[PDB]
Design a protein around this ligand. Structure first.
Ligand SMILES: CO[C@H]1CCO[C@@]2(C)Oc3c(C)c(O)c4c(c3C2=O)C2=NC3(CCN(CCn5c([N+](=O)[O-])cnc5C)CC3)NC2=C(NC(=O)[C@H](C)CCC[C@H](C)[C@H](O)[C@@H](C)[C@@H](O)[C@@H](C)[C@H](OC(C)=O)[C@@H]1C)C4=O
Lengths: 88, 49, 96, 1126, 49, 291
DNA sequence: GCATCCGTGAGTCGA
DNA sequence: CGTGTCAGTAGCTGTCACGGATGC
């Protein structure tokens, strides 16, 4: 049916990264106010996408230890964000 | 070349039908050649740039 | 990637250079599948050659997570990086 | 009085010349063509009184040219006849609403004749849904009104050209035989005194090769072409000789790669030029050939094909023209001059209208179906064949759809104001298939031709790249069945003007001499002066005795278009500003309330009525019930007809098409009278603007060079307020992970933004919506594997599970704001046929009430345009003696340059219309008012007048009227006999030192408003391939810093600004994000990186087998975050 | 060759550039505009930069 | 001229054998993308059709070589492969171009670089964010170094700066809600915007940019309405009458760019014509009559 | 050795 | 899958100046 070189076809576009950049800045700020352990765990679960056992193997700690560190660090980031007025 | 018959009337007086018709020739060609002349002007300008 | 490099060199591309660039040969003339939108193997949009359609997602669907970063999938042959590589990975056609 | 025929308001005309012939149907060009195409009873009766014997419509003509269809043996035959139409499938407004095509099913009678069995089966076969033309002369394709525009093409026939050679500087001559269909054939005489022929673009053979291939002996050639030495040299320099030799030569040059048989070439040289299958000169083409050569000039037009005699006579014409001969008689033919043709002359430039343009596409589709018929005959058995089995209507309907789809003359009629649509339907363009390319159009095709008089307007034409290629039909002009444009003339018997009127074509007009319309004529008909200004062939204007005038013009405005004829005092404006005024009248915006102009021309009434945007009574009667919704008319016989009003309809280009009733309950109304008028109409006349009190003076520099100062009264009283309507559309489809659903539940949105939505997620009717507000709440399911690491962490730190959908709601674009007036919902669940893969569709109509603002473009009728530079308070305005402030201030400097004195005259007369006048009746009628009609000697305030084009008010009568203007309510005359008045500075109070010209001028609001033209962008979408910002305001794109702007930066030496523009602000993928972060952080601007477009350039040069590499200062090649494997 | 290929006759310049194997010293207004460097003119020269 | 051709291959060290190809490169897919249409159908780039025809004919040639087909078929197939590669690299260069649907010549690889629509002139010599455009209006009260811009234009042009200042003065809690505030046009931003554009120059441009004075720097003043207010004296340099023509506004971000606008491109520092030295910002129309 | 013919170029910005 | 009597573009020239390789 169609050819991109032919007129009448809309060109593809990609949105700007403004919202993503602002969220990334706020997440970095909230991350700085965390302990080295909690930060090093959340940066290995969400930024590296490893499993629970993988982080437990890397950091040389227990399975439930990684679970509990993630469970608290998530809520600590939520505390910081809600203190700064981040929308739910 | 100029028409052997001029437009004797003035725009204050009001041109006749044929006077207006013969004026439109020069008017339209003066507007027409302007686009091509600007085209060649811009082309020479970019060459000089 | 600093912005100070002196010369920009141009020259004839040897067929061996064309093979040195190409991440695989485009054998089949097909493009994609018109139901699943998945590109056909060895086609003009083959993910084994050019790259994954989506980030960290291979063709057969075995590796869909970020933890398997850089794994050459054995069942579909697709690497697992971002789709950005589909803007720079060259193919080639070997002429008879 | 002016135009006292329908029942219009009494507009009094300054007319000195009577109108012998009234304006024809301005919509006849679109109407008559389509009526002939479908063979309507109106066209049949018109041709019946025209003298025609057994007329044939376009469809019947196609069916007769097609029938019969036979195979090689002749054992099978198929024939078509009797084309008829059933009722229309759906009404006009239903097609506009449901986005379908206005069409009626077409039925024909087809039958199969079998010669080998002696039995025939005849039946009715449905051909297709044939698109029908509306009463307004428009078609409706997929719910959009479109106008098929008449095309100026090169008429079929034989044409001769006198060219000048480049190298030898000798006069060469060439011939072209252009058929209505088939292969082309062009003879020529090169610079070597030899004659050659190009057959269908192919190689140029010697002319004697073609003569020998047709069966002419070498002796008869010398017998025919012996009087010229060039033909002797042609036959001597010839390569091959023989009847069966040159034929095979033509075969091998025409169809290469095939075995050349004597009969295989004998077949095609007869089929390509002499059989009606692959070659056809139309009746007009055959007639043009019979006139140009002077043969068969008395025989009835029965030969629809080219003959060998015509080829021989053409070669004779050429060879005589080459050596200075000026006269020739074909052996057995009448005498004809030997000359070259203009191909721009309107006798050789043909016009094909809607009917022919559709007929050609129907013919192509019918041929594509005929091939299918011949294929299906030889495959199926010769006893179970019916007309239903041989006919595959797919290519026919596909062809008409392609025409109304991917055609060239099918364009959507400009709906800014009624005049724009009328003008649209009366356009005559040279572009399109069969015409010419824009790159193939010199300065000679575009300029005015002397044959355009009374046929195509020399004023109304665009000033852009399409200048001269697009004209407008003259007022009284019409098209004959041949395709040429006829214009009416008054026949002068023996120096006596007669009321007998006859339409002449271009060459017919050239065969006589015509007198100008404004000729002094006795009450009996004899010319006052013996010598009168008369037009003659080749555009000659000269005096000539009165006993020489053959015809004369009908009306002074005979040469102008409808829009051009609406410019008062047009004879006082130069052609440039007149062109601009005529073109800007079509850009007028329909205001909330409409005012007819005080200074008119008489054309407004017929323009408004013939446009079709008013409501005229079909039959006489009384008004039974009148409402804002409909008007019911009780006829004399007893029947009732009800006309429904079109209220607040999105008029195409976003304007508001709103009709309002004029009559009241129990009003006797005659047939053809306007009972309700629509946009830009006041009591049935075109109201493209408002009458504004104007003063011609500079005012503190706010009107400096073409800027305009307005009174805020025009904002307070909605004088230039206009309604605009925008259409917003969104659909819910089926995606790979589910289906998009339109719901009020949108993730992470407060109950306050969704407060204007109903329970479905649609904005409610009557809600005022700014930019960014939600119109339709749509969510689309997004996969888990498509999530950003930060986005997945953010989803985890908020505990919001089951939000696998993202927001894709329909929001209001930037710069839009108004009241939601209409919602339309189409659901696949509710039997509504949507495209495959779509579950729901919503259209929201938003209406905005735009008051006149600073920067909106106003303009008059004389090409005087400008934007609004300032809107002062009503007290700041220079006010007259009685305290009434002016409405608009126009700079004086921009008046005597443009040579548009009309706006000044219109001003003077304008004031005379606002105040009224009374001529001194005592001691006889004064010497200036001797030519004025008795209806003009007295005028009440706010009277309407007519100044016809090239007629109307003269400066003497205007100067006289300014001297006897009526006083105001206090008894004081405010303006002087010079036309100026004393004004007071509303800011200081001191009166202005000198009198200023003050009057009333008709000002139009053009469709160039700052509400649409303002745009700004910080960041936004980027093109996926080049990673540069988008273009256009609708896509929220940025401005293009072009090449010349880069030259400007470099000339300034602004290195850093230029690098910033071309890197971090454009296509630097990582630089733009870090710049945004550095701005929101308060940091400094980072260092620019490498543009992505340059990377793309390198990757393309690589694809062109070019080894491009970037080297460092040492010489080692550096990569760009990429490698290379084998 | 980069400044010439962007002016006129792109293919005719690129062919001779690949045949002669020309290397472009990216030191010019047009070249630096294309690649995103500061133009060697005005505030971009090394004296003021 | 023959030596001009031969000595290049002699000295450079690259073999002329590169002019004959054994393998042809395929450009990455994102540079020849295939998009889906809102009607369910698809629209692809012409380069895909060219590559596809090359692939088809090459595979057919492989079949003919395997089957030992007569030399006539194999040679007539190799010719078609040659023409297909020729069309892929420069369609229409030899003979008639490969037409697509509707007798439209398909674009080749070399067409991505040719003319005004090519890569060089369309995406390299000219490209921008932080820019706007609107109709121009004469502003007599303005000073020569001043220009009047609409508030709605300046808000979007200075959006990130306004967000920063909204989060500084505690009008907004975080930068995210500051963005939402600017998008919703909360009444605070209008008091903040005035502080932002203070002495921050902008660039006004009117096409065609004939000389360097076709782009000039101005001090922005927040004015009501939706039109740009231009000084009457700079109308000569821009060749700008007030009959419906628009101008573009560009916002310099970096300190160097603002300095170049303040010093090099300011309208008050460019009164004379660089071509002749005679003044341009002088009384011209109403002003010369008044004097 | 020269007339022929091929290929190159032909303003910018808009909604 | 097998295929088997005639079975044969649309469109179009209504651009031109200019230089130099290509060709009788
Ligand atoms: C199928 O109809 C198309 C033609 C087909 O093709 C061509 C080759 O045959 C044409 C015929 C037979 C015409 O009569 C016209 C043209 C063309 C063609 O060009 C035309 N062609 C142009 C001039 C060059 N372009 C600009 C280049 N451009 C591009 N770009 O991509 O290049 C993107 N943006 C822009 C501005 C604009 C059109 N004006 C044009 C006109 N207007 C004027 O002269 C008037 C002074 C005022 C305008 C009235 C009003 C505005 C129009 O009535 C609107 C309501 C539509 O009716 C119109 C838009 C229509 O659009 C549709 C889909 O209906 C097309 C006419 C023609 O009367």
């Amino acid at each position: 049916v169609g050819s991109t070189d032919q007129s009448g076809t809309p060109e593809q576009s990609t949105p700007d990264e403004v919202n993503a950049a602002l969220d990334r800045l706020l997440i970095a700020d909230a991350l700085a106010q965390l302990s080295a352990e909690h930060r090093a765990v959340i940066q290995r679960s969400y930024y590296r996408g490893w499993s629970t056992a993988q982080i437990a193997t890397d950091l040389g700690i227990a399975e439930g230890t990684v679970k509990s560190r993630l469970h608290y660090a998530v809520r600590a980031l939520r505390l910081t964000l809600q203190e700064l007025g981040v929308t739910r | 070349e100029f028409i052997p018959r001029p437009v004797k009337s003035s725009f204050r007086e009001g041109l006749t039908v044929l006077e207006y018709f013969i004026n439109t020739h020069g008017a339209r060609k003066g507007l027409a050649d302007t686009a091509l002349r600007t085209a060649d002007s811009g082309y020479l300008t970019r060459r000089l740039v | 990637d600093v912005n100070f490099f002196d010369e920009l060199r141009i020259g004839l591309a040897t067929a061996e250079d064309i093979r040195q660039w190409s991440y695989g040969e485009v054998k089949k003339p097909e493009t994609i599948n018109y139901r699943t939108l998945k590109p056909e193997k060895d086609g003009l949009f083959c993910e084994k050659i050019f790259g994954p359609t989506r980030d960290w997602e291979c063709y057969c669907g075995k590796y869909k997570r970020v933890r398997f970063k850089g794994i050459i999938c054995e069942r579909c042959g697709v690497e697992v990086t971002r789709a950005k590589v589909r803007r720079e990975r060259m193919g080639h056609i070997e002429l008879a | 009085s002016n135009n006292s025929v329908p029942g219009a308001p009494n507009r009094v005309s300054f007319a000195k010349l009577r109108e012998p012939l009234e304006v024809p149907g301005l919509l006849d060009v679109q109407t008559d063509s389509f009526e002939w195409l479908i063979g309507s009873p109106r066209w049949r009766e018109s041709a019946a009184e025209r003298g025609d014997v057994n007329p044939v419509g376009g469809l019947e003509e196609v069916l007769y040219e097609l029938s019969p269809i036979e195979d090689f043996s002749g054992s099978m035959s198929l024939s078509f006849s009797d084309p008829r139409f059933d009722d229309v499938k759906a009404p006009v407004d239903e097609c506009k609403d449901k986005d379908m095509t206005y069409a009626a099913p077409l039925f024909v009678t087809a039958e199969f004749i079998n010669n080998n069995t002696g039995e025939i089966k005849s039946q009715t076969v449905f051909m297709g849904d044939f698109p029908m033309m509306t009463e307004k002369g428009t078609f409706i394709i997929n719910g959009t009104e479109r106008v098929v525009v008449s095309q100026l093409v090169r008429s079929p026939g034989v044409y001769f050209d006198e060219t000048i050679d480049k190298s030898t500087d000798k006069t060469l001559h060439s011939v072209k035989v252009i058929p209505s269909r088939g292969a082309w054939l062009e003879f020529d005489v090169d610079k070597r005194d030899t004659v050659g022929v190009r057959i269908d673009r192919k190689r140029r053979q010697p002319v004697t090769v073609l003569l020998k291939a047709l069966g002419w002996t070498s002796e008869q050639i010398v017998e025919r072409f012996g009087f010229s030495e060039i033909m002797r040299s042609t036959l001597e320099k010839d390569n091959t000789v023989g009847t069966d030799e040159a034929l095979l030569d033509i075969y091998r040059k025409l169809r290469p790669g095939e075995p050349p048989t004597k009969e295989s070439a004998q077949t095609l040289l007869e089929n390509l030029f002499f059989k009606e299958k692959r070659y056809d000169l139309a009746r007009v083409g055959r007639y043009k050939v019979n006139k140009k050569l002077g043969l068969h000039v008395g025989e009835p037009i029965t030969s629809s094909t080219l003959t060998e005699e015509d080829v021989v006579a053409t070669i004779e014409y050429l060879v005589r023209l080459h050596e200075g001969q000026t006269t020739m008689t074909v052996p057995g033919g009448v005498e004809v001059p030997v000359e070259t043709d203009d191909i721009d002359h309107f006798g050789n430039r043909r016009l094909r209208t809607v009917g022919e343009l559709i007929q050609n596409q129907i013919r192509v589709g019918m041929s594509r179906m005929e091939r299918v018929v011949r294929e299906r005959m030889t495959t199926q058995d010769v006893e179970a064949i019916t007309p239903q089995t041989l006919i595959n209507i797919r290519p026919v309907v596909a062809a008409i759809k392609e025409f109304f789809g991917t055609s060239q003359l099918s364009q959507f009629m400009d709906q800014n104001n009624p005049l724009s649509g009328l003008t649209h339907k009366r356009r005559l363009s040279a572009l399109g298939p069969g015409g010419l390319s824009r790159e193939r159009a010199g300065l000679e095709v575009r300029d005015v031709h002397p044959s355009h008089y009374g046929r195509m307007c020399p004023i109304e034409t665009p000033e852009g790249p399409n200048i001269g290629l697009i004209g407008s039909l003259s007022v009284y002009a019409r098209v004959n069945p041949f395709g040429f444009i006829e214009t009416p003339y008054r026949k002068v018997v023996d120096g006596v003007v007669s009321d007998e009127i006859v339409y002449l074509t271009a060459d017919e007009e050239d065969r006589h001499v015509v007198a100008q319309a404004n000729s002094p004529i006795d009450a009996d008909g004899r010319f006052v002066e013996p010598r009168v200004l008369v037009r003659r062939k080749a555009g000659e204007v000269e005096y000539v005795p009165s006993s020489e005038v053959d015809y004369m013009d009908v009306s002074p405005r005979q040469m102008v278009s409808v829009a051009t004829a609406m410019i008062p005092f047009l004879e006082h404006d130069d052609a440039n500003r007149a062109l601009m005024g005529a073109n800007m009248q079509r850009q007028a915006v329909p205001l909330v309330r409409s005012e007819a102009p005080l200074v008119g021309t008489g054309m407004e009434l017929r323009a408004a009525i013939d446009a079709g945007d008013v409501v005229v009574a079909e039959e006489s009667g009384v008004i039974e019930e009148v409402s804002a919704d409909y008007i019911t008319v009780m006829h004399d016989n007893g029947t009732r007809r009800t006309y429904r009003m079109r209220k607040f309809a999105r008029s195409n280009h976003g304007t508001c098409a709103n009709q309002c009733p004029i009559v009241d309950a129990g009003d006797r109304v005659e047939a053809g009278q306007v009972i309700a008028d629509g946009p830009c109409t006041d009591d049935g006349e075109m109201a493209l603007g408002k009458n504004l009190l104007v003063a011609i003076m500079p005012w503190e520099g706010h009107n400096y060079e073409d800027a305009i100062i307005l009174s805020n009264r025009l904002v307070e009283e909605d004088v230039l307020t206009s309604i605009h309507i925008e259409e917003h559309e969104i659909d819910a489809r089926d995606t790979k992970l589910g289906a998009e659903e339109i719901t009020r539940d949108i993730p992470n949105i407060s109950d306050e933004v969704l407060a204007d939505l109903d329970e479905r997620g649609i904005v409610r009717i009557g809600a005022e919506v700014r930019d960014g507000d939600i119109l339709v709440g749509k969510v689309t399911p997004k996969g888990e594997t498509e999530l950003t690491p930060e986005e997945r962490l953010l989803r985890a730190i908020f505990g919001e599970k089951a939000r696998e959908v993202r927001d894709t709601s329909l929001k209001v674009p930037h710069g839009e704001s108004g009241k939601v007036i209409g919602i339309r919902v189409f659901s696949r669940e509710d039997e509504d046929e949507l495209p495959a893969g779509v579950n729901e569709l919503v259209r929201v109509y938003v209406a905005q009430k735009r008051k006149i603002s600073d920067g909106d473009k106003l303009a008059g009728r004389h090409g005087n345009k400008g934007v609004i530079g300032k809107i002062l308070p009503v007290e700041d305005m220079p006010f007259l003696a009685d305290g009434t402030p002016v409405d608009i201030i126009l700079n004086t400097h921009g008046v005597p340059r443009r040579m548009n004195i009309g706006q000044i005259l219109e001003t003077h007369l304008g004031w005379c219309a606002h105040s009224g006048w009374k001529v001194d009746a005592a001691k006889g009628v004064p010497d200036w008012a001797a030519r004025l009609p008795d209806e003009l000697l007295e005028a009440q305030p706010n009277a309407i007048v007519s100044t016809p084009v090239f007629d109307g008010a003269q400066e003497a009568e205007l100067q006289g009227l300014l001297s006897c203007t009526l006083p105001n309510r206090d008894g004081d005359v405010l303006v002087d006999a010079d036309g100026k008045a004393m004004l007071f500075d509303g800011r200081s109070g001191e009166p202005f030192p000198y009198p200023v010209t003050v009057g009333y001028m008709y000002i139009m609001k053009l469709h160039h408003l700052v509400d649409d033209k303002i745009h700004a962008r910080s960041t936004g979408p980027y093109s996926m391939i080049t990673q540069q910002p988008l273009g256009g305001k609708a896509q929220f794109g940025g401005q293009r810093f072009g090449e010349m702007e880069c030259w400007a930066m470099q000339a300034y030496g602004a290195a850093y600004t230029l690098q910033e523009l071309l890197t971090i602000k454009s296509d630097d993928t990582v630089g733009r994000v870090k710049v945004y972060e550095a701005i929101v952080k308060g940091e400094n601007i980072p260092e620019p990186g490498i543009p992505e477009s340059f990377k793309v350039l390198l990757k393309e040069l690589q694809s062109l087998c070019l080894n491009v590499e970037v080297l460092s200062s040492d010489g080692a090649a550096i990569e760009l975050r990429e490698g290379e494997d084998e | 060759w980069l400044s010439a290929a962007s002016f006129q006759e792109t293919t005719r310049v690129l062919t001779d550039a690949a045949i002669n194997c020309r290397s472009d010293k990216l030191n010019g207004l047009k070249e630096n505009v294309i690649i995103g460097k500061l133009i060697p003119a005005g505030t971009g020269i090394n004296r003021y930069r | 001229k023959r030596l001009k051709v031969v000595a290049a291959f002699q000295q450079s060290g690259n073999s002329p054998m590169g002019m004959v190809l054994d393998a042809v490169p395929v450009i990455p897919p994102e540079l020849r993308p295939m998009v889906q249409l809102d009607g369910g159908r698809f629209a692809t780039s012409d380069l895909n059709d060219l590559y596809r025809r090359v692939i088809n004919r090459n595979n057919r040639l492989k079949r003919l070589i395997d089957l030992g087909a007569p030399e006539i078929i194999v040679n007539n197939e190799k010719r078609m492969l040659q023409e297909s590669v020729d069309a892929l690299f420069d369609n229409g260069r030899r003979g008639r171009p490969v037409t697509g649907p509707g007798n439209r010549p398909l674009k080749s690889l070399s067409d991505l670089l040719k003319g005004k629509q090519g890569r060089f002139r369309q995406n390299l010599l000219g490209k921008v964010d932080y820019s706007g455009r609107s109709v121009i209006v004469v502003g007599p009260q303005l000073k020569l170094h001043q220009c009047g811009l609409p508030k709605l234009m300046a808000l979007e042009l200075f959006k990130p700066f306004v967000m920063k200042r909204l989060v500084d003065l505690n009008h907004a809690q975080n930068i995210k809600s500051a963005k939402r505030m600017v998008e919703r046009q909360r009444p605070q931003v209008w008091d903040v915007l005035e502080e932002v554009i203070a002495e921050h120059p902008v660039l006004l441009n009117r096409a065609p940019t004939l000389h360097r004075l076709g782009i000039q720097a101005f001090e922005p003043m927040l004015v009501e309405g939706k039109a740009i207010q231009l000084h009457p004296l700079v109308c000569e340099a821009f060749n700008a009458d007030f009959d419906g023509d628009q101008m573009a506004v560009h916002l310099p971000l970096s300190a160097e760019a603002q300095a170049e606008a303040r010093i090099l491109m300011l309208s008050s520092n460019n009164i004379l014509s660089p071509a002749s030295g005679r003044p341009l910002a002088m009384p011209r129309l109403d002003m010369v009559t008044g004097l």
